[PDB]
Amino acid sequence: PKYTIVDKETCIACGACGAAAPDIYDYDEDGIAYVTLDDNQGIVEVPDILIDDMMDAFEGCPTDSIKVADEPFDGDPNKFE
Numbered sequence: 139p140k141y142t143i144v145d146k147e148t149c150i151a152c153g154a155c156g157a158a159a160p161d162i163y164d165y166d167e168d169g170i171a172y173v174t175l176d177d178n179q180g181i182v183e184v185p186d187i188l189i190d191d192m193m194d195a196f197e198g199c200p201t202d203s204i205k206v207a208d209e210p211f212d213g214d215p216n217k218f219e
């Protein structure tokens with residue numbers, strides 16, 4: 139399975155992610171992206187139908203704040219860094 143999460147400390151509101159995968163990434167009140175599947179905790183498996191969009195957002199983010207992994211992040215966007 140794939141999991142995704144936004145590192146809110148490195149996100150600078152580039153806005154590429156919400157457009158590429160609106161069913162995965164949205165913006166909080168401060169304009170910072172987060173994953174709507176699981177309240178940005180990187181624990182819900184990304185639906186198969188949304189993998190391509192996820193990849194588009196992952197590749198498009200200028201700050202590499204979107205992370206993609208094969209195991210849950212359990213809330214830590216830098217777990218695999």
Ligand SMILES: *SCCNC(=O)CCNC(=O)[C@H](O)C(C)(C)COP(=O)(O)OP(=O)(O)OC[C@H]1O[C@@H](n2cnc3c(N)ncnc32)[C@H](O)[C@@H]1OP(=O)(O)O
Pocket residue numbers: 150151152153154155157158194197198200
């Ligand atoms: S990043 C936010 C803080 N930065 C700024 O405000 C920077 C001013 N913008 C820039 O200098 C350029 O936008 C970036 C991309 C930061 C540096 O350019 P890149 O050469 O790395 O190039 P890309 O052009 O491929 O970025 C493409 C995409 O970025 C998304 N995008 C660009 N500009 C915007 C705005 N204004 N709003 C939303 N998205 C924007 C698009 O998703 C686009 O990429 P896709 O790969 O097609 O999804």
Ligand code: F3S
Pocket residue numbers: 144148149150151152153154155156170171198199200201202203204
């Ligand atoms: S900088 Fe933030 S707004 Fe989305 S494209 Fe990258 S996570």
